[PDB]
């Protein structure tokens, strides 16, 4: 199969910017390359086919170019509706193959996470389970790492994480992290700590909950 590599998976830009997304095939694909746009609701549209042909109804701020192995999609003046994921696809050889995709995001100033931590509720403890929940809200850039510690001891097992897509109003990201233990193990410890590593700070951003409080 022909491998298609899009140069990056995530690309930042400002509205009104000229944006270029590129991909590269593992062999010459003879201009048999198309670009598709996928929106967060899962819907998909073709934008460009045969390298540079604009599909009817697609705004002409979209353009494509390339030859051989190397191709680019360009948006001349980024609009809000253009924030989406873009996939390239070769039709030179069967099977048709797609690039991994490039998601656009809105560029903005760095923002530190607002971190909040929550103990298991009484309702949950009666069921024999215990989840400690940490929200890390409205940060930018999206890259972030969360570490859990129980009474000083780092804890990986039982942690589940979830991330939002970029906020439509303030262009930040949020994350939620949940440590789940048995009620028994939970009751054997006091200090639960969520610590975030993020570009905005040299030291960890730490929120703790202590069963003594």
């Amino acid at each position: 199969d022909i491998v298609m590599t899009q140069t990056t998976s995530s690309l930042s830009a400002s509205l009104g910017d000229r944006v270029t997304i590129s991909c590269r095939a593992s062999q010459d694909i003879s201009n048999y390359l198309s670009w598709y746009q996928q929106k967060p609701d899962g819907t998909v549209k073709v934008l460009i086919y045969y390298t540079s042909k604009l599909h009817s109804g697609v705004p002409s701020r979209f353009s494509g170019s390339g030859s051989g192995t190397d191709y680019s999609l360009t948006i001349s003046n980024l609009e809000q509706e253009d924030i989406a994921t873009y996939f390239c696809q070769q039709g030179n050889t069967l099977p048709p193959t797609f690039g991994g995709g490039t998601k656009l995001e809105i560029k903005r100033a760095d923002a530190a996470p607002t971190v909040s931590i929550f103990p298991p509720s009484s309702e949950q403890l009666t069921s024999g389970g215990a989840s400690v929940v940490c929200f890390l809200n409205n940060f930018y850039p999206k890259d972030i790492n969360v570490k859990w510690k129980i009474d000083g001891s780092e804890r990986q097992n039982g942690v589940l994480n979830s991330w939002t897509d970029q906020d439509s109003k303030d262009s930040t990201y949020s994350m939620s992290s949940t440590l789940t233990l048995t009620k028994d193990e939970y009751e054997r410890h006091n200090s639960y700590t969520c610590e975030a590593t993020h570009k905005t700070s040299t030291s960890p951003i730490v929120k703790s909950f202590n069963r003594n409080e």
């Binding site: 048999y32 198309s34 598709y36 899962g42 819907t43 998909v44 549209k45 073709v46 086919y49 045969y50 599909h55 996939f87 696809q89 070769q90 039709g91 030179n92 069967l94 099977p95 048709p96 193959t97 797609f98 690039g99 991994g100 995709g101 607002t114 909040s116 931590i117 929550f118 103990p119 298991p120 509720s121 309702e123 949950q124 069921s127 989840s131 929940v133 929200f135 809200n137 589940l160 994480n161 979830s162 991330w163 939002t164 949020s174 994350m175 939620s176 949940t178 789940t180 909950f209 409080e213």
Partner: protein, 218 residues
Amino acid sequence: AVQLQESGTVLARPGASVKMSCKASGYTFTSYWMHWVKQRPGQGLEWIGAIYPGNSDTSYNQKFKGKAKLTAVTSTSTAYMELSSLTNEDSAVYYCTRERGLYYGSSSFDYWGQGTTLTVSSAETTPPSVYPLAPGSSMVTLGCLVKGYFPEPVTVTWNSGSLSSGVHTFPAVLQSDLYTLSSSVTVPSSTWPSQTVTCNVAHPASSTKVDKKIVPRD
């Protein structure tokens, strides 16, 4: 207008076979190749195969031979894909898409259906438990933990929608067959706990709606 209308979300037991459909309109169904594409939800797109409904010629990705069966019904302009021996790895969104250029083709896809979500699971419909998140500044953040439900989706609102600003509802994660999600809300400390704050959780599949007030803890 060309339109491809795919059948709805399907839940399937492991080891089963599922059949999904794609109703074409606005063009001569029998003159274009209909392709199917798989998207696992943290990755790109994978080509499954195609059928030419004019004579039922088919073409399959080697990776999907013995897995997918493509058919088409001319009288109803509907393409079907049947997937066999289902496993967790088959859980995905499947698209049907028309190939530009008629029989001669182009290997470019000019119109796409909206996608069909296939979820393969041995779990049967079960309601979430909704747990309050209260902590123990000008602002306070509160939350709800919606745990151990199946299938997707749930909806979460706060004070019946009047708190929309400063809310984050996070994508559900799968733990031990079941989904769990969390949602946070941030308000002025002046308003909580003086005023009431409640997460309203609805799980349509189990006909459940739960209101969970967030109480101070001490």
